[PDB]
């Protein structure tokens, strides 16, 4: 009984970085030297396990989250850092076991013209709790006189599409990052 | 009209080399990816890989890897195919696919096939 | 991979019946399956991308449905000119699978 790991690093279509995916990976037998030594991931950088023993270790439940965000800001996807991914778009808690998969994504990702399918969360009125999504649209601060649900000067629209071409540089280039998040069910 | 054009059909010997072309017209050919699917004589559709246009990352499936190299002339307009050491058991009809969009990757306009025959 | 069954191998119905072809896929490709028509010798041809859209020049008789791990192509009256070999392809995951097909008689 294998874990799914085909179904979470394989798919078409990963989801924008607010409505960032989640799959439970329970009763199975997982395998975590295939990805070790797969040769495709620019970041697999594992925070309270070493990777190189996680094939051994037995955990109660796997969560892979998958998202898709800008190439300048896998630093974010990180315990205890700060940038507009990890405050308002994707938490992760400081004592975080599981660790983080990203790798570039030009080839699948990238439209010419602009591939303005990926938002990310730009706005919002305070930081993000560990592991919560924030998949609400609504108009941000009205400082002044309230946006009555309409956009304009002073009253922000939250989400901010991404753009994805294949001449950006690497760092506006786009990277699909899966996130392992440990505790038994799933063992090695 | 919105067309993929194959080259003609092809009878090689065992250990030689085949370049089949695929010539995109009707469309602009950077924005779309060109998909390469392999049939044999009574047998199924079978994926072989694809190339991307506006990056030049060819990708291959399971069992055509080494063998199998895609590569593409942008300014012609065209996509190729290097079937490097044919054996015996490279008998097969080769299409080149287009896609429809970026992530609905469903081919909705083909080629004509190369009938590679090989003995 | 994603192995994709379709069952039955050939199917003889009528000249004007219903005619359900079904693609069970090994895991859940959500609605992301599409269906072609490869008539002997010609290319194959789109025919369904996901079970909304139809391709162009495509007649209404052909109608899709089913969603996540079962998947029915179904044709409403068989008319002589959709005689073929359908193949159900999955495009959810990577690699890019192919049914094994499913030759229409009358």
């Known amino acids: 009984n294998l874990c799914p790991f085909g179904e979470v690093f394989n798919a078409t279509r990963f989801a924008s970085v607010y409505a960032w995916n989640r799959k439970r990976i329970s009763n199975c037998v997982a395998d975590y030297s295939v990805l070790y030594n797969s040769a495709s991931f620019s970041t697999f950088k594992c925070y309270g396990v070493s990777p190189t023993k996680l094939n051994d270790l037995c955990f109660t439940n796997v969560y892979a989250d998958s998202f898709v965000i800008r190439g300048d800001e896998v630093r974010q996807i990180a315990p205890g850092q700060t940038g507009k991914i990890a405050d308002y778009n994707y938490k992760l808690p400081d004592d975080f076991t599981g660790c983080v998969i990203a790798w570039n994504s030009n080839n699948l990702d990238s439209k010419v013209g602009g591939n303005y399918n990926y938002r990310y969360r730009l706005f919002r009125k305070s930081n993000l709790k560990p592991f919560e999504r924030d998949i609400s649209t609504e108009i941000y601060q009205a400082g002044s006189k309230p946006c009555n649900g309409v956009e304009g000067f002073n009253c922000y629209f939250p989400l901010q599409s991404y753009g994805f071409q294949p001449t950006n540089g690497v760092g506006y280039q786009p990277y699909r990052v899966v996130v392992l998040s440990f505790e038994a069910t799933v063992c090695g | 009209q919105v067309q993929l054009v194959q080259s003609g059909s092809a009878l090689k010997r065992p250990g030689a080399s085949v370049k089949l072309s695929c010539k995109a017209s009707?469309?602009?050919?950077?924005?779309?990816?060109i998909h390469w699917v392999r049939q044999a004589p009574g047998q199924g559709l079978q994926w072989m890989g694809w190339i991307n246009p506006n990056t030049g990352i060819p990708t291959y499936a399971q069992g055509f890897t080494g063998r199998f190299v895609f590569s593409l002339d942008t300014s012609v307009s065209t996509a190729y195919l290097q079937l490097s050491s044919l054996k015996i058991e490279d008998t097969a009809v080769y299409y080149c696919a287009r896609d429809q969009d970026l992530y609905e990757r469903a081919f909705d306009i083909w080629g004509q096939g190369t009938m590679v025959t090989v003995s | 991979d994603v192995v994709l069954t379709q069952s039955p191998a050939t199917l003889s119905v009528s000249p004007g019946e219903r005619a359900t072809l079904s693609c069970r896929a090994s895991?859940?490709?959500?609605?992301?399956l599409a269906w072609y028509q490869q008539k002997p010798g010609q290319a194959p041809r789109l025919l369904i991308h996901g079970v909304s859209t139809r391709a162009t020049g495509v007649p209404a008789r052909f109608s899709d449905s089913g969603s996540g791990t079962e998947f029915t192509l179904t044709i409403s009256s068989l008319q002589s000119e959709d005689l073929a070999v359908y193949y159900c392809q999955q495009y959810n995951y990577w690699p890019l699978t192919f049914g094994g097909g499913t030759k229409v008689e009358i």
């Open positions: 009707g469309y602009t050919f950077i924005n779309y990816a």
């Open positions: 895991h859940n490709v959500g609605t992301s």
